[PDB]
Amino acid sequence: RRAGYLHLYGLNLVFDRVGKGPPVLLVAEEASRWPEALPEGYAFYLLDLPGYGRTEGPRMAPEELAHFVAGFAVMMNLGAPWVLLRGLGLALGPHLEALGLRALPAEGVEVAEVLSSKLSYG
Amino acid sequence: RRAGYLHLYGLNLVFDRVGKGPPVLLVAEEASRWPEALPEGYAFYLLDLPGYGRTEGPRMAPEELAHFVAGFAVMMNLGAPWVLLRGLGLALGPHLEALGLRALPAEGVEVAEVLSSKLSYG
Numbered sequence: 679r680r681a682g683y684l685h686l687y688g689l690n691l692v693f694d695r696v697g698k699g700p701p702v703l704l705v706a707e708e709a710s711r712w713p714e715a716l717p718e719g720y721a722f723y724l725l726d727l728p729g730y731g732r733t734e735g736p737r738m739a740p741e742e743l744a745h746f747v748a749g750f751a752v753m754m755n756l757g758a759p760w761v762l763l764r765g766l767g768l769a770l771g772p773h774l775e776a777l778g779l780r781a782l783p784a785e786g787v788e789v790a791e792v793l794s795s796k797l798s799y800g
Numbered sequence: 801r802r803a804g805y806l807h808l809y810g811l812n813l814v815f816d817r818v819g820k821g822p823p824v825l826l827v828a829e830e831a832s833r834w835p836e837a838l839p840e841g842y843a844f845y846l847l848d849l850p851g852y853g854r855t856e857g858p859r860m861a862p863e864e865l866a867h868f869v870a871g872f873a874v875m876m877n878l879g880a881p882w883v884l885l886r887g888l889g890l891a892l893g894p895h896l897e898a899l900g901l902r903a904l905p906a907e908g909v910e911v912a913e914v915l916s917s918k919l920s921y922g
Binding site for chain 1 (some may be wrong): 809867871874898
């Protein structure tokens with residue numbers, strides 16, 4: 679696994695990367711909320727949202743946070759990756775949708791099962 | 801006015817730039833639709849939308865084009881710049897606002913009057 683950061687909106691948003699394949703954003707308060715073994719075949723980006731984990735920043739409302747996530751997708755040239763949500767991430771869902779990013783709640787369910795359900799044979 | 805380019809969403813969006821200060825996006829089909837003399841104090845970015853002028857691209861819907869504009873702003877680290885509209889650009893207004901950018905119609909007015917009026921009156 680690997681850590682890195684993107685300078686965006688005057689902040690340095692820290693995140694973890696791992697895997698190769700179509701890109702998928704994993705969004706919770708921070709990378710630590712995704713402990714499960716992730717599946718092969720996808721380029722995962724685990725964001726630490728501003729104000730949590732390793733990303734220094736102020737505490738912002740859900741809609742402001744959603745712009746940081748939409749901002750991340752375009753600045754990293756990920757196009758329109760799917761966004762899995764957990765914890766504080768859940769509250770971003772509606773806002774992400776309005777920004778053109780499909781949001782998939784993954785609270786209490788492993789990433790491997792989510793990507794399979796919403797993709798695998800059906 | 802210095803010409804430039806930004807690779808975005810697979811395309812090379814050409815734009816003209818002039819001025820220093822708060823950033824301001826002038827969006828119409830392309831740059832030459834802003835003949836007026838622009839006021840000092842703003843960093844103006846005049847876009848040639850995909851498919852028009854110097855920007856090679858397919859004909860896209862207004863909601864799709866609003867995405868390019870938003871993409872341009874975060875990509876160029878412009879924060880939340882106001883977007884003045886003219887011609888084709890006017891159709892983008894609603895979608896732009898929904899993406900978090902304030903759109904101002906500049907159909908009949910020269911940019912300087914639009915900005916001084918919006919900033920000073922009301």
